[PDB]
Amino acid sequence: DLDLAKASATDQLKKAKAEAQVIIEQANKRRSQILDEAKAEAEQERTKIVAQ
Amino acid sequence: AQAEIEAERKRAREELRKQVAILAVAGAEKIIERSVDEAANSDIVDKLVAEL
What we know:
This is part of a larger assembly, with 2 copies of chain A (about 50 residues).
Chain A: H1 2-51
Protein backbone atom coordinates (compact mmCIF):
# COMPACT_ATOMS: atom_id res chain seq x y z
CA ASP A 1 0.00 0.00 0.00
CA LEU A 2 2.70 2.49 0.91
CA ASP A 3 4.62 1.77 -2.28
CA LEU A 4 1.56 2.04 -4.51
CA ALA A 5 0.47 5.23 -2.77
CA LYS A 6 3.94 6.68 -3.34
CA ALA A 7 3.87 5.59 -6.98
CA SER A 8 0.39 6.76 -7.96
CA ALA A 9 0.82 9.99 -6.01
CA THR A 10 4.21 10.91 -7.47
CA ASP A 11 3.12 10.16 -11.03
CA GLN A 12 0.43 12.84 -10.69
CA LEU A 13 2.93 15.69 -10.64
CA LYS A 14 4.98 14.31 -13.53
CA LYS A 15 1.70 14.16 -15.44
CA ALA A 16 0.53 17.66 -14.51
CA LYS A 17 3.83 19.31 -15.44
CA ALA A 18 3.29 18.22 -19.04
CA GLU A 19 -0.10 19.94 -18.92
CA ALA A 20 1.50 23.12 -17.65
CA GLN A 21 3.59 22.80 -20.80
CA VAL A 22 0.36 22.25 -22.74
CA ILE A 23 -1.01 25.52 -21.38
CA ILE A 24 2.13 27.53 -22.12
CA GLU A 25 2.39 26.15 -25.65
CA GLN A 26 -1.27 26.84 -26.38
CA ALA A 27 -0.78 30.29 -24.88
CA ASN A 28 2.00 31.15 -27.29
CA LYS A 29 0.29 29.60 -30.33
CA ARG A 30 -2.94 31.53 -29.83
CA ARG A 31 -0.75 34.58 -29.16
CA SER A 32 0.80 34.05 -32.59
CA GLN A 33 -2.73 33.87 -33.99
CA ILE A 34 -3.52 37.19 -32.29
CA LEU A 35 -0.51 38.93 -33.77
CA ASP A 36 -0.78 37.38 -37.24
CA GLU A 37 -4.40 38.48 -37.42
CA ALA A 38 -3.82 42.04 -36.22
CA LYS A 39 -0.90 42.47 -38.62
CA ALA A 40 -2.92 41.55 -41.71
CA GLU A 41 -5.89 43.67 -40.70
CA ALA A 42 -3.65 46.67 -40.01
CA GLU A 43 -2.18 46.07 -43.47
CA GLN A 44 -5.63 46.28 -45.05
CA GLU A 45 -6.35 49.38 -42.94
CA ARG A 46 -3.28 51.20 -44.22
CA THR A 47 -4.15 50.13 -47.75
CA LYS A 48 -7.64 51.59 -47.36
CA ILE A 49 -6.36 54.96 -46.21
CA VAL A 50 -3.81 54.79 -49.04
CA ALA A 51 -6.44 54.23 -51.72
CA GLN A 52 -8.43 57.10 -50.20
CA ALA B 1 1.18 55.21 -44.65
CA GLN B 2 1.39 58.89 -43.72
CA ALA B 3 4.75 58.98 -45.52
CA GLU B 4 3.67 56.95 -48.54
CA ILE B 5 0.86 59.40 -49.20
CA GLU B 6 3.29 62.31 -48.98
CA ALA B 7 5.70 60.66 -51.40
CA GLU B 8 2.84 60.36 -53.87
CA ARG B 9 1.89 64.01 -53.49
CA LYS B 10 5.47 65.14 -54.06
CA ARG B 11 5.76 62.88 -57.07
CA ALA B 12 2.53 64.06 -58.69
CA ARG B 13 3.49 67.70 -58.15
CA GLU B 14 6.82 66.97 -59.83
CA GLU B 15 5.28 65.31 -62.87
CA LEU B 16 2.89 68.22 -63.28
CA ARG B 17 5.76 70.69 -63.11
CA LYS B 18 7.56 68.62 -65.74
CA GLN B 19 4.70 68.75 -68.22
CA VAL B 20 4.13 72.47 -67.81
CA ALA B 21 7.88 72.98 -68.11
CA ILE B 22 8.26 71.25 -71.44
CA LEU B 23 5.13 72.91 -72.81
CA ALA B 24 6.53 76.34 -71.93
CA VAL B 25 9.56 75.99 -74.18
CA ALA B 26 7.83 73.94 -76.87
CA GLY B 27 5.42 76.84 -77.21
CA ALA B 28 8.07 79.54 -76.99
CA GLU B 29 9.84 78.01 -79.98
CA LYS B 30 6.69 78.26 -82.09
CA ILE B 31 6.06 81.82 -80.93
CA ILE B 32 9.57 82.86 -81.91
CA GLU B 33 9.65 81.14 -85.28
CA ARG B 34 6.24 82.64 -86.03
CA SER B 35 7.14 86.17 -84.86
CA VAL B 36 10.61 87.03 -86.20
CA ASP B 37 11.68 89.63 -88.77
CA GLU B 38 14.95 91.09 -89.96
CA ALA B 39 14.71 94.00 -87.52
CA ALA B 40 14.52 91.51 -84.65
CA ASN B 41 17.39 89.54 -86.18
CA SER B 42 19.54 92.64 -86.60
CA ASP B 43 18.95 93.81 -83.04
CA ILE B 44 20.22 90.53 -81.61
CA VAL B 45 23.19 90.06 -83.91
CA ASP B 46 24.30 93.65 -83.38
CA LYS B 47 23.94 93.35 -79.62
CA LEU B 48 26.04 90.20 -79.52
CA VAL B 49 28.79 91.33 -81.90
CA ALA B 50 29.18 94.34 -79.61
CA GLU B 51 30.30 91.98 -76.82
CA LEU B 52 32.31 89.74 -79.13
